[PDB]
Amino acid sequence: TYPFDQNRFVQYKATSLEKQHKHDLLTEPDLGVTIDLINPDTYRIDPNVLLDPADEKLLEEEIQ
Amino acid sequence: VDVTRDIVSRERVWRTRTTILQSTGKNFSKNIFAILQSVKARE
Amino acid sequence: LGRACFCLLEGDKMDQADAQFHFVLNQSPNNIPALLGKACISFNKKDYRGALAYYKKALRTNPGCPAEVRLGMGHCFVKLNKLEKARLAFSRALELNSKCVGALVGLAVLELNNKEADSIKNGVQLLSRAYTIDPSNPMVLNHLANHFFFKKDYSKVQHLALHAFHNTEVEAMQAESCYQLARSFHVQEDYDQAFQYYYQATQFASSSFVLPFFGLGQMYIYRGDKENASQCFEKVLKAYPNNYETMKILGSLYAASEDQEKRDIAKGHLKKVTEQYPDDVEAWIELAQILEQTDIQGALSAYGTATRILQEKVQADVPPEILNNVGALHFRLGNLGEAKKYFLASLDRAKAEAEHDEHYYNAISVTTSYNLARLYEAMCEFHEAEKLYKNILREHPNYVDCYLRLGAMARDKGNFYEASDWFKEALQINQDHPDAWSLIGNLHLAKQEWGPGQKKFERILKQPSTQSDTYSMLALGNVWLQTLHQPTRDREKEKRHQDRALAIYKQVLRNDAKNLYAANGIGAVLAHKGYFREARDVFAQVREATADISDVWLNLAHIYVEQKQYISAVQMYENCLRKFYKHQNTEVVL
């Protein structure tokens, strides 16, 4: 048989298998927002409403 | 001695006695035991 | 709302919370976080479509929200690779409030894809700014931890990975915390603690990702715990196959012999890496290391490029264990001469292992010389075979196989030589040795007048430590069948002998269906029972099983001449004469 090194250690490393993983964001289980109908003391629905171009292109689901 | 365990560990046996007798194909014995019982049906 | 948000705290009554939020829309759908709390429930049920359906209704209205509805927008856009929308959502989150953490860490993970590209902005802008605005955020602590690992800062990773463990309470995050502390102490070789971290990392959240499983499996290489290494690494293949996860199961080869659950997967990994080359060096070694049971030519080819692969990285001579084994391959091939050259250069390379009594090149030379003497026997150079054998026995007399191959050599001369005495002293040095003990009665096969006496000399290692011994019990069947063809069958004596051999053959039948000498025995005894139409069938089976059994050639033609089928029989007789054994075998022409 061949006297193999016991490969108890990583030096390649597994970093190809590591940084390919995109890591979840689960800081707050309701997705990082306090869910409240009382803290909206303000509302943009009054004149005038605000809606940035970035905000319209996020109001679409998939239209590209 | 240390030579004994020293050699018998590092070598390998791929060819023993017993699997010479056993066939490299798959020849089961149900067919064999079926005709074994069939000759007993003549008995 | 109070009872619906009461439900998310405890992880249950979750559809109940969604229903009481939908009770809000049928009583008062007058503001959006009533229905956004539905969408976080939908998100946590992995229904990002049902999340974003209500999430479209957020930004059309946008109630008073410093908490950035766009943050969760981007996190849903993190899901299912809607990244460019995620970037824009986190960007506008930063424009409304740069102080908020979720946008910056979202883009930090978003650019965790490219590390060699845009390293610094990930390290400092995307991470250290999140550390600045919150030094207690276990995300950014975990990510600076794994960066410091890759930046080889192994100190402050253990400063902040503990806090990254304690400050979080969800399993996958503290699984990653334990995993990162485990990879920290693994490269720091504090493997006892890091093993526990790997196990906790697996036990916290398992379905997340498989690096903790890899950590435990390679940790089982420590401390000899490798049984669970295979089991844990199976989920790595259940995760997804890679080049990485071949070599772990290949080197961790519980596949020894006739164990396909580790051996077929070994074949699959070996032809997963053979076409590859992630600096393959030993990949051919553990290729051929299972190929010796299988096709020998595959082992030859593996050794062929394995001989080369030790020369280009450095011009390094091939270790003699390889060269001895390739000569051992050619021994069962026709390449006997270069097998001899392999053994010669093997012994030279072992001599070139001048100082390697750790590896015990001397012992390797001992077994190499054993192989070379066995080769000289194939040359029929029994003189030099004697020389090598007595050289080994004069230096390692504890060895037995050399002690009896010498005996076998004189057995070729005859039985009552020192053949029989080397055989008996092989039992004297090792009475536990079943091979030599079988060979004792094999000598006594010559003396067939010592037929009924062979019960005793084949009972000695019918101790059940040696049992089951198929070879010996078939020898019992054979010495029991040579009793037959006598005029005492009508006296029921050979009928009892036939049924006793039948009982032996049933026993070896049940313990092995795939033995062929057994089935030859059954067919022989029933042919002696006069069932020759019932014999050619059972011999036909072993005939396709292997033609290279000299007995079955005879026994089939006995049936043929029993139908007087001479023109089917004598040809197969001379086919049996096609072996290189004896120019006039007597009983065959009889």
From Swiss-Prot, chain A:
Localization per record: Nucleus
Recorded family membership: Belongs to the PAF1 family.
Function: Component of the PAF1 complex (PAF1C) which has multiple functions during transcription by RNA polymerase II and is implicated in regulation of development and maintenance of embryonic stem cell pluripotency. PAF1C associates with RNA polymerase II through interaction with POLR2A CTD non-phosphorylated and 'Ser-2'- and 'Ser-5'-phosphorylated forms and is involved in transcriptional elongation, acting both independently and synergistically with TCEA1 and in cooperation with the DSIF complex and HTATSF1. PAF1C is required for transcription of Hox and Wnt target genes.
Subunit structure: Component of the PAF1 complex, which consists of CDC73, PAF1, LEO1, CTR9, RTF1 and SKIC8. The PAF1 complex interacts with PHF5A. Interacts with POLR2A, TCEA1, SKIC3, KMT2A/MLL1, SUPT5H, RNF20 and RNF40. Interacts with UBE2E1. Interacts with PINT87aa which is encoded by the circular form of the long non-coding RNA LINC-PINT; the interaction enhances the binding of the PAF1 complex to target gene promoters and may anchor the complex on target gene promoters, sequentially pausing RNA polymerase II-induced mRNA elongation. (Microbial infection) Interacts with influenza A strain H3N2 NS1 protein; the interaction interferes with host cell gene transcription, specifically with that of antiviral genes.
Name used for this protein in its record: RNA polymerase II-associated factor 1 homolog
Organism from which the protein derives: Homo sapiens (Human)
Gene (UniProt): PAF1
Span of the entire protein shown here: 50 to 113 of 531
UniProtKB/Swiss-Prot annotation, chain B:
Chain segments carrying region Interaction with CTNNB1: 1-33
Cell compartments where the protein resides: Nucleus
Post-translational modification: Phosphorylated. Dephosphorylated by PTPN11.
Tissue expression: Found in adrenal and parathyroid glands, kidney and heart.
Domain of life the protein comes from: Eukaryota
Summary of subunit composition and partner proteins: Component of the PAF1 complex, which consists of CDC73, PAF1, LEO1, CTR9, RTF1 and SKIC8. The PAF1 complex interacts with PHF5A. Within the PAF1 complex interacts directly with PHF5A. Interacts with POLR2A, CPSF1, CPSF4, CSTF2, KMT2A/MLL1 and CTNNB1. Interacts with a Set1-like complex that has histone methyltransferase activity and methylates histone H3. Found in a complex with BCL9L or BCL9, CDC73, CTNNB1 and PYGO1 indicative for the participation in a nuclear Wnt signaling complex. Interacts with PTPN11. Interacts with SETD5. (Microbial infection) The PAF1 complex interacts with Zika virus French Polynesia 10087PF/2013 non-structural protein 5/NS5. The interaction with viral NS5 proteins may reduce the antiviral immune response by inhibiting the recruitment of the PAF1 complex to interferon-stimulated genes, thus preventing their transcription.
Function of the molecule: Tumor suppressor probably involved in transcriptional and post-transcriptional control pathways. May be involved in cell cycle progression through the regulation of cyclin D1/PRAD1 expression. Component of the PAF1 complex (PAF1C) which has multiple functions during transcription by RNA polymerase II and is implicated in regulation of development and maintenance of embryonic stem cell pluripotency.
Family note: Belongs to the CDC73 family.
Identification of the protein by name: Parafibromin
Organism: Homo sapiens
Boundaries of the shown chain within the full protein: 218 to 260 of 531
From Swiss-Prot, chain C:
GO molecular function, a single term: SH2 domain binding
Keyword Phosphoprotein: yes
Alphabetic keyword roster: Nucleus, Phosphoprotein, Repeat, TPR repeat, Transcription, Transcription regulation, Wnt signaling pathway
Subcellular location: Nucleus speckle
Expression sites (tissue/organ): Widely expressed.
GO cellular component, one term: euchromatin
Keyword Phosphoprotein in record: yes
TPR repeat start and end residues: 1-31, 32-65, 67-100, 104-137, 175-208, 210-243, 281-313, 320-353, 366-399, 400-433, 435-467, 482-515, 516-549, 550-583
Swiss-Prot/TrEMBL GO biological process terms: blastocyst growth; blastocyst hatching; cell surface receptor signaling pathway via JAK-STAT; cellular response to lipopolysaccharide; endodermal cell fate commitment; inner cell mass cell differentiation; interleukin-6-mediated signaling pathway; negative regulation of gene expression, epigenetic
Subunit text: Component of the PAF1 complex, which consists of CDC73, PAF1, LEO1, CTR9, RTF1 and SKIC8. The PAF1 complex interacts with PHF5A. Interacts with KMT2A/MLL1. Interacts with STAT3. Interacts with SETD5. Interacts with ERCC6.
Summary of the function given for this chain in its UniProt record: Component of the PAF1 complex (PAF1C) which has multiple functions during transcription by RNA polymerase II and is implicated in regulation of development and maintenance of embryonic stem cell pluripotency. PAF1C associates with RNA polymerase II through interaction with POLR2A CTD non-phosphorylated and 'Ser-2'- and 'Ser-5'-phosphorylated forms and is involved in transcriptional elongation, acting both independently and synergistically with TCEA1 and in cooperation with the DSIF complex and HTATSF1. PAF1C is required for transcription of Hox and Wnt target genes.
Name listed for the protein in its UniProt record: RNA polymerase-associated protein CTR9 homolog
Organism of provenance: Homo sapiens (Human)
The encoding gene: CTR9
Shown segment, full-protein numbering: 132 to 721 of 1173
